[PDB]
PDB file of C-alpha atoms (C1' of nucleotides) in Angstrom:
ATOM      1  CA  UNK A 228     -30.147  46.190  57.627  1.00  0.00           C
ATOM      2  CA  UNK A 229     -29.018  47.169  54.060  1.00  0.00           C
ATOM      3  CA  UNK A 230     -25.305  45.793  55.025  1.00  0.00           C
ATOM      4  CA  UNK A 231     -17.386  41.106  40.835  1.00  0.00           C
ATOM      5  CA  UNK A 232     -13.537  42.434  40.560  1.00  0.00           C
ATOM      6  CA  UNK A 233     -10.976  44.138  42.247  1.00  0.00           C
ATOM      7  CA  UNK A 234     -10.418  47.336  40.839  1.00  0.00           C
ATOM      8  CA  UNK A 235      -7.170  47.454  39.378  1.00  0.00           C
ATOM      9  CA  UNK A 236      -5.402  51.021  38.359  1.00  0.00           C
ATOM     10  CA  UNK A 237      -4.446  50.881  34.831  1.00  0.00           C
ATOM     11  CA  UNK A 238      -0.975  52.322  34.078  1.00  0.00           C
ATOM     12  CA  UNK A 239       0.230  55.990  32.834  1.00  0.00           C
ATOM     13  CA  UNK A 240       0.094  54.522  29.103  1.00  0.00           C
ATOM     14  CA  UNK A 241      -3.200  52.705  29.691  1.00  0.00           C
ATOM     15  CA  UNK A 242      -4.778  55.243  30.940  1.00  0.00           C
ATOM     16  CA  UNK A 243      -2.506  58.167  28.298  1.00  0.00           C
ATOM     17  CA  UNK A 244      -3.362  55.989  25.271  1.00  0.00           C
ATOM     18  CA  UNK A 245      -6.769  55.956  26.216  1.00  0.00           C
ATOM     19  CA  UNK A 246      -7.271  59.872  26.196  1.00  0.00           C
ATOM     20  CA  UNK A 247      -5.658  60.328  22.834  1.00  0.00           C
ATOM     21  CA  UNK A 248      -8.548  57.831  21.476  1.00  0.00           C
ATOM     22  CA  UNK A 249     -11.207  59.988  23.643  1.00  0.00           C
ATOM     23  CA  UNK A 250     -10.005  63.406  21.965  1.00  0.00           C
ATOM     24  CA  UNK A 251     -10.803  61.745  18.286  1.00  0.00           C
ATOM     25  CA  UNK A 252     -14.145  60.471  19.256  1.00  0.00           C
ATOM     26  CA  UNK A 253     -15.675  59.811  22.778  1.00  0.00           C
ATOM     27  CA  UNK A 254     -17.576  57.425  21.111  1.00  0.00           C
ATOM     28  CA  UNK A 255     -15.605  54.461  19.221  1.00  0.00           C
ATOM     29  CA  UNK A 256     -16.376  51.895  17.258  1.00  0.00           C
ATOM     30  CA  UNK A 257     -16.534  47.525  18.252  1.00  0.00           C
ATOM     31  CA  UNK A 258     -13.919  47.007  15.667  1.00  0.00           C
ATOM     32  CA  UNK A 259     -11.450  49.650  16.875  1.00  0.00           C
ATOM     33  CA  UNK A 260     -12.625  49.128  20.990  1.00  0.00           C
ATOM     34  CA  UNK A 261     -11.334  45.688  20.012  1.00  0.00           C
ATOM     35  CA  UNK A 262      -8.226  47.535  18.695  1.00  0.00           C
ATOM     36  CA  UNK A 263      -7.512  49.339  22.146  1.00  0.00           C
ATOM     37  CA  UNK A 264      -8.070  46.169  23.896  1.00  0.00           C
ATOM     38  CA  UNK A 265      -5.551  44.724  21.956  1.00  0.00           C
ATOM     39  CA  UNK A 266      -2.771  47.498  22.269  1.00  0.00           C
ATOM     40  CA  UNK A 267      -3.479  48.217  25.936  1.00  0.00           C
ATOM     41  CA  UNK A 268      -3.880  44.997  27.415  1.00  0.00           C
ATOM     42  CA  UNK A 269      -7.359  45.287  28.458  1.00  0.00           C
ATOM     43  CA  UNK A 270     -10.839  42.974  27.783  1.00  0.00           C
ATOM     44  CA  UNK A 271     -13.062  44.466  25.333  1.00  0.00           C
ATOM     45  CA  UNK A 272     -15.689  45.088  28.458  1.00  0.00           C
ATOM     46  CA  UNK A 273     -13.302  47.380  30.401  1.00  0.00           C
ATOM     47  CA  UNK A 274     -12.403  49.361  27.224  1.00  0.00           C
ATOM     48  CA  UNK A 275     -16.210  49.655  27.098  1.00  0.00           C
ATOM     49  CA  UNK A 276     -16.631  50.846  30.636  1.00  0.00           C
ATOM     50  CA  UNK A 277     -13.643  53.078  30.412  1.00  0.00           C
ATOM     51  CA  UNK A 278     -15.104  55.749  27.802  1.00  0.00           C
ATOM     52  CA  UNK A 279     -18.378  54.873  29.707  1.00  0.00           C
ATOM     53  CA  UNK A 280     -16.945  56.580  32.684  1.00  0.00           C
ATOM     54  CA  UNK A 281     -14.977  58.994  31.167  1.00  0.00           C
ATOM     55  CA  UNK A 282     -17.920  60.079  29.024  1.00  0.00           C
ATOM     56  CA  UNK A 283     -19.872  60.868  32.568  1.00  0.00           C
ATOM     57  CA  UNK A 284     -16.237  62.919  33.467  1.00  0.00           C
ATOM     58  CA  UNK A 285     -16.708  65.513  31.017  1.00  0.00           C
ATOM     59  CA  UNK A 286     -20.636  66.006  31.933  1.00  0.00           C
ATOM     60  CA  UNK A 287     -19.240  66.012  35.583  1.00  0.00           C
ATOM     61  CA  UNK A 288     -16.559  68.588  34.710  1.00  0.00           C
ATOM     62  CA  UNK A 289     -18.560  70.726  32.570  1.00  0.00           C
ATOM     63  CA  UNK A 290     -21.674  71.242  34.545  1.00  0.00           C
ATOM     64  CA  UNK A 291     -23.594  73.895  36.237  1.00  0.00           C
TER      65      UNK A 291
ATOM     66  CA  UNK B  11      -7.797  66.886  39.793  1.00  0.00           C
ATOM     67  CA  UNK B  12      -9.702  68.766  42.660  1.00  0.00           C
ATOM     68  CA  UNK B  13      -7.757  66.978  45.130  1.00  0.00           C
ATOM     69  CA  UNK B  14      -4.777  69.011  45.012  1.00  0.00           C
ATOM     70  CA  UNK B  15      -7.265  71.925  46.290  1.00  0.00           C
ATOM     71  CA  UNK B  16      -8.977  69.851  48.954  1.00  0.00           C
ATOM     72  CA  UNK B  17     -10.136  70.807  51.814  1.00  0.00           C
ATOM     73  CA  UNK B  18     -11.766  69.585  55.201  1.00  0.00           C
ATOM     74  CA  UNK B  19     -15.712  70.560  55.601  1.00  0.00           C
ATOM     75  CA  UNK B  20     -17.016  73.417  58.459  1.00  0.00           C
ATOM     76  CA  UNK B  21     -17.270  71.274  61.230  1.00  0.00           C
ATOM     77  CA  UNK B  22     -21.126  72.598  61.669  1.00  0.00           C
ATOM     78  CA  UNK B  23     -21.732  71.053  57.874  1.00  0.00           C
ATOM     79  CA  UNK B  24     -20.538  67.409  59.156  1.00  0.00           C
ATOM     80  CA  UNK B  25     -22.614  67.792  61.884  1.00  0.00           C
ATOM     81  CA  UNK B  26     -25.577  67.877  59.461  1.00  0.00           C
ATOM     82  CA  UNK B  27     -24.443  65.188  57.133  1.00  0.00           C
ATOM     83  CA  UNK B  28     -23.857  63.145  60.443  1.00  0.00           C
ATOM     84  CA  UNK B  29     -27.017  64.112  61.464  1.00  0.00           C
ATOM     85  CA  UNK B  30     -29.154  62.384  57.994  1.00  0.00           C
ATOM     86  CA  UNK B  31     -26.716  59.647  58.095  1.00  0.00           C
ATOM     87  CA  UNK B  32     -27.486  58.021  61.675  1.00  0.00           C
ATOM     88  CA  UNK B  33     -30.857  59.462  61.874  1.00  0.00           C
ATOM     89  CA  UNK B  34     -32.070  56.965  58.109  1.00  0.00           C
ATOM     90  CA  UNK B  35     -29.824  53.734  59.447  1.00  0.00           C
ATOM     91  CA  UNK B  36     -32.110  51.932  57.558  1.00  0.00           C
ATOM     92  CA  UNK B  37     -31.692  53.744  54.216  1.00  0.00           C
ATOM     93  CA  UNK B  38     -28.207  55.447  53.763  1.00  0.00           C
ATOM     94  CA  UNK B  39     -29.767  57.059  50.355  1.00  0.00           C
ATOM     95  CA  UNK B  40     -30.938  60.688  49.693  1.00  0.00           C
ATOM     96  CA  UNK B  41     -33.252  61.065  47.245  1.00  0.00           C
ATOM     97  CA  UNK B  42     -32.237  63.674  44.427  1.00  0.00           C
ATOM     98  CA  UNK B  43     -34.361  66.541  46.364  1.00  0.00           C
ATOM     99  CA  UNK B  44     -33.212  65.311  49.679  1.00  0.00           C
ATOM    100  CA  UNK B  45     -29.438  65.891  48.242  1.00  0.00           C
ATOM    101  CA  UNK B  46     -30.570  69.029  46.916  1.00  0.00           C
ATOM    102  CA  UNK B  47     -31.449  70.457  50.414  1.00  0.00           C
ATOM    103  CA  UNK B  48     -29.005  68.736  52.175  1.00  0.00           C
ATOM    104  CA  UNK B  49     -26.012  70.443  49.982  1.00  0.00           C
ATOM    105  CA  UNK B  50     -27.545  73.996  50.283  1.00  0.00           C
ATOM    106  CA  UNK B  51     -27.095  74.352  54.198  1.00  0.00           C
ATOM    107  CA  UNK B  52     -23.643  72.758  54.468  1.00  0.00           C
ATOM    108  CA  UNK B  53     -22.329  75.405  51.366  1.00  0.00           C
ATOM    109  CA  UNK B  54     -21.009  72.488  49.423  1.00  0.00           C
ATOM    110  CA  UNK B  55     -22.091  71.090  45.516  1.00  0.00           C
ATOM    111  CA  UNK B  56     -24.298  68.563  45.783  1.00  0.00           C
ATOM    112  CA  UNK B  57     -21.781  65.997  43.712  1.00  0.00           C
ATOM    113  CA  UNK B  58     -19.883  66.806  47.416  1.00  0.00           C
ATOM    114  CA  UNK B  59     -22.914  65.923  49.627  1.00  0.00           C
ATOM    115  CA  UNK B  60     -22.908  62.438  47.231  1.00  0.00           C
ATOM    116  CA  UNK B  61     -18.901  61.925  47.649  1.00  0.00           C
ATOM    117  CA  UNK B  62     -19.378  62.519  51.235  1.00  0.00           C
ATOM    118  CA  UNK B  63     -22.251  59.520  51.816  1.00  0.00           C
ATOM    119  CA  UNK B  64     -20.698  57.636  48.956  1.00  0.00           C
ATOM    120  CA  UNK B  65     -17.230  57.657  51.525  1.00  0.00           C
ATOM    121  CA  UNK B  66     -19.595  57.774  54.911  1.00  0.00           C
ATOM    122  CA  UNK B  67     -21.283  54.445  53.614  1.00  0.00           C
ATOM    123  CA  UNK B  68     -18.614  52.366  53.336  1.00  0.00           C
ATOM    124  CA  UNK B  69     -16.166  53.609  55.961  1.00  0.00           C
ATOM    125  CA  UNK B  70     -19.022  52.846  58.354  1.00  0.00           C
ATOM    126  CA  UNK B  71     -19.097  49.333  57.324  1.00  0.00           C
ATOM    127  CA  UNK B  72     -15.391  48.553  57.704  1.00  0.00           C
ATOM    128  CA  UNK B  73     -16.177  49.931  61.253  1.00  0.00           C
ATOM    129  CA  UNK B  74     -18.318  46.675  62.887  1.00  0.00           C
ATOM    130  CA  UNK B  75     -16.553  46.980  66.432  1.00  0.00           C
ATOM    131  CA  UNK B  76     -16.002  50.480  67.075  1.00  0.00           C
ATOM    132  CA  UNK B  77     -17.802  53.356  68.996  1.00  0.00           C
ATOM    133  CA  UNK B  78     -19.168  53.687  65.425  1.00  0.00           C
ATOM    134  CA  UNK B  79     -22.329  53.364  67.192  1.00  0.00           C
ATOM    135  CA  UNK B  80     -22.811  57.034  67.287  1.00  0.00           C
ATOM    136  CA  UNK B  81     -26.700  57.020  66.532  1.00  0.00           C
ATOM    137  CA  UNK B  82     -27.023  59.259  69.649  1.00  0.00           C
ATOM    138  CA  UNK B  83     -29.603  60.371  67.356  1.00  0.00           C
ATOM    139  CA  UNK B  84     -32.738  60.293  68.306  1.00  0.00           C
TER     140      UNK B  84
ATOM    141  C1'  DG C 139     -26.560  54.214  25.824  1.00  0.00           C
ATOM    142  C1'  DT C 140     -26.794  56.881  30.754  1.00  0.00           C
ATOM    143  C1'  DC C 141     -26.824  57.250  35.962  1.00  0.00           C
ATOM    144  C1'  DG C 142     -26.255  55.845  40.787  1.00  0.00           C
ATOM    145  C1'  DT C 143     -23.300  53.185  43.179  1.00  0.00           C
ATOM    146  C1'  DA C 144     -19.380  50.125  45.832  1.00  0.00           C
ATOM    147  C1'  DA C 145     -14.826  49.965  46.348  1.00  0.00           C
ATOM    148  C1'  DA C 146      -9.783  50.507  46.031  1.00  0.00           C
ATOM    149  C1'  DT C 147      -6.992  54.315  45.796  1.00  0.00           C
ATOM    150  C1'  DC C 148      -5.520  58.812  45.706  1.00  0.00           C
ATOM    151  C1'  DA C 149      -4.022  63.501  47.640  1.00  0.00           C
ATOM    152  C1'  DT C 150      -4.018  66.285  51.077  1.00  0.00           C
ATOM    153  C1'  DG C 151      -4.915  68.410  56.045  1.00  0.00           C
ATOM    154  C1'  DC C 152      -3.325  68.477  60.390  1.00  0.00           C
TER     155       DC C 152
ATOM    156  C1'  DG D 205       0.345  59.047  60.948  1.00  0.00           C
ATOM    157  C1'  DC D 206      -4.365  58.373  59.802  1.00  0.00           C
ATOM    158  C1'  DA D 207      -8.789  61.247  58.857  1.00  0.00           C
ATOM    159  C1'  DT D 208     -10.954  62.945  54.889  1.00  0.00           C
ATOM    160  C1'  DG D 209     -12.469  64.661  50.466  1.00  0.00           C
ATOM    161  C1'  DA D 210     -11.983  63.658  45.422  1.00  0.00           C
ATOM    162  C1'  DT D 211     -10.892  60.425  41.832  1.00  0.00           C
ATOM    163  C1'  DT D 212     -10.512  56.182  39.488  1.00  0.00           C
ATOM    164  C1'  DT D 213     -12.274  50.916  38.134  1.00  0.00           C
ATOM    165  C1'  DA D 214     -16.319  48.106  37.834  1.00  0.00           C
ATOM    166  C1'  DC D 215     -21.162  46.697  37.784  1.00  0.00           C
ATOM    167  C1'  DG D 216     -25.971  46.604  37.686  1.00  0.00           C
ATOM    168  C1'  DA D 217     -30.498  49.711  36.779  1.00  0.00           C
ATOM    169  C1'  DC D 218     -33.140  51.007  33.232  1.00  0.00           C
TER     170       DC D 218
END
DNA sequence: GTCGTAAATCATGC
DNA sequence: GCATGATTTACGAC
């Protein structure tokens, strides 16, 4: 009937760094998305996908 | 992290998520409204009733030679 | 962009 | 000791 990656668990600073960038501004810009990609060993499309997701947390958190 | 204050479901609830899940082999999907309905009898947030045939869906696939073949249902 | 997911993984219940 | 609910990557809809 109805029957691209392995998801991989990014580490404690990964993930850490990550929230400290999300408390400035949930959204960032190319130029600094770059940046975190950079610092936190990550491609610049699952830096993207990250605040994505993490974006949907909050409205998923705070909802009623 | 609401897994530290996890709990299992009433065992009458899984019989009615159970129930919509065999029942639509064919399409595994709620609609929105469906969802809506389908979380207010079993007491649970409707984000639940989604984690619940989000994990239902693909443990039943891993399952291709067990007495998963519980579509008594009818 | 968001929103519904598949899937690996998590944390716990028993 | 797995069953089970909730969370975390990852991708395609739109």
């Amino acid at each position: 009937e109805w029957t691209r990656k392995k998801r991989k668990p990014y580490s404690k600073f990964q993930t850490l760094e990550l929230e400290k960038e999300f408390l400035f501004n949930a959204y960032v810009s190319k130029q600094k998305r770059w940046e975190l990609a950079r610092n936190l060993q990550l491609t610049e499309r699952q830096v993207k996908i990250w605040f994505q997701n993490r974006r949907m947390k909050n409205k998923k958190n705070s909802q009623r | 992290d609401a897994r530290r204050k996890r709990r299992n479901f009433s065992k009458q609830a899984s019989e009615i998520l159970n129930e919509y899940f065999y029942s639509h082999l064919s399409n595994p999907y709620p609609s929105e409204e469906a969802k809506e309905e389908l979380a207010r009898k079993c007491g649970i947030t409707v984000s639940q009733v989604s984690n619940w045939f989000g994990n239902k869906r693909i443990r039943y696939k891993k399952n291709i030679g067990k007495a998963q073949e519980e579509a008594n249902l009818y």
